[PDB]
Design a protein around this ligand. Structure first.
Ligand SMILES: C[As](C)(=O)[O-]
Ligand SMILES: C[As](C)(=O)[O-]
Ligand SMILES: [Ca+2]
Ligand SMILES: [Ca+2]
Ligand SMILES: [Cl-]
Ligand SMILES: [Cl-]
Ligand SMILES: [Cl-]
Ligand SMILES: [Cl-]
Ligand SMILES: [Cl-]
Ligand SMILES: [Cl-]
Lengths: 232, 231
């Protein structure tokens, strides 16, 4: 209803090649924005979540068909994993998982009501299990926006068996002096290397910035330029 | 079915008591944090009122017993959606000048009457309550940074109102210390740049301190590992 898909090509900072396309939810707005309140309303009702899920999986499959040679990243909030429908549509798209990355978002949404009786430890176990399942289906799993939301180092550590990628988004950290932010970037870069994970830095304004990040010992990673998403 | 423990916080280098932390425990043969019980209380306003009345009175008894010392209490951000929480912080406010509110990294379910708020409006509502607590003169610490929801983004959002950030080695057993040390150094610098106090908890012994120093963790309060006990 109030929903549509956008794509953001993810462009390598140094040579500008398209590494993958990320899929983004947007509203039907004058100027489309992420539909935060609408997705939360859907997440709070199993029947609406089922309709949303049917829409999303079909629309996304249409995109996969239209670009059959490329990798697609989709965003899934951990709280989505409390609905079996989420895993059911990942299962139905599983012939394409070799070219799909599931970016687990940093979002803290209200847990669907039929799983609210679980304590905090049992909730984390349930989610980790579902991440196991997604990994088992052969999706690449990435942690999105690390050091944001609930994507703290502890969480990244719990997900670690099942992930291939850590993403750090400069955009989420505007007001931190870069020389201060650089120490967190260096920490995550080293973590990624030690654990044979790909490290991605998103929201890099120019190649100038790359070199900037380059002096202060961030050696191995993929950088993505800032660019506007657009309708699919 | 709840009781309070205290954990004296002991300086790693000279062993003095910096402050005492108040910890919730159940009535078990071996007491543990009563996670399920506290979540059930958080899910029901009437039980939360009754728990709040118990807690605040019990904690006030403690304060009277040790009138010269600083006490740290843990508050989960979701407790801020209940007006009762600010009501008892308001009632204890004559002592706020020796109380630290440690905002925990917990992700509990938000009380039902505030679930209608979108994620942005929920964050603003918590931030407003933290402003209030800071306004009452409490010291506010962020507990267990880089755990739970206490990510760098959150710490940034809390920043005007905090004086302390705490990093707990205990939460990160399986990270090789030379890798963990880069995160510790990042937070140590963040604290200095922002004139926050940096605390590293869960230091087993004095050698660790040298390590921390050799890797740019210059100014911090180290705390030893020790057992809490009934108040
Ligand atoms: C070329 As590929 C590893 O993104 O499927
Ligand atoms: C010396 As003090 C501010 O920790 O009571
Ligand atoms: Ca993403
Ligand atoms: Ca604490
Ligand atoms: Cl999205
Ligand atoms: Cl379900
Ligand atoms: Cl973090
Ligand atoms: Cl506690
Ligand atoms: Cl660990
Ligand atoms: Cl320091």
């Amino acid at each position: 209803m109030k929903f549509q898909l956008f794509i953001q090509p993810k462009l390598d900072v140094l040579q500008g090649n398209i590494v993958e396309y990320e899929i983004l939810l947007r509203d039907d707005s004058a100027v489309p924005r992420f539909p935060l309140s609408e997705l939360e309303a859907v997440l709070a009702d199993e029947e609406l979540y089922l309709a949303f899920s049917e829409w999303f999986s079909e629309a996304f499959l249409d995109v996969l068909k239209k670009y059959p040679n490329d990798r697609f990243a989709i965003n899934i909030a951990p709280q989505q994993l409390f609905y079996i429908e989420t895993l059911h549509w990942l299962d139905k798209l599983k012939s394409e998982s070799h070219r799909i990355t599931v970016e687990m978002t940093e979002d803290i949404f209200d847990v669907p009501g039929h799983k609210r009786h679980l304590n905090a430890n049992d909730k984390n176990a349930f989610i980790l299990n579902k991440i196991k399942v997604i990994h088992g289906l052969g999706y690449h799993i990435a942690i999105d926006d690390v050091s944001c939301g609930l994507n703290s180092l502890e969480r990244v550590m719990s997900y670690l068996p099942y992930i291939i990628e850590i993403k750090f988004s400069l955009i989420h950290f505007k007001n931190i002096p870069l020389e201060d932010l650089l120490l967190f970037i260096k920490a995550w870069a080293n973590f990624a290397q030690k654990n044979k994970l790909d490290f991605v830095v998103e929201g890099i304004e120019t190649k100038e910035t790359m070199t900037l990040l380059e002096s202060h010992g961030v050696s191995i990673f993929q950088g993505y330029l800032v660019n506007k998403p657009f309708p699919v």
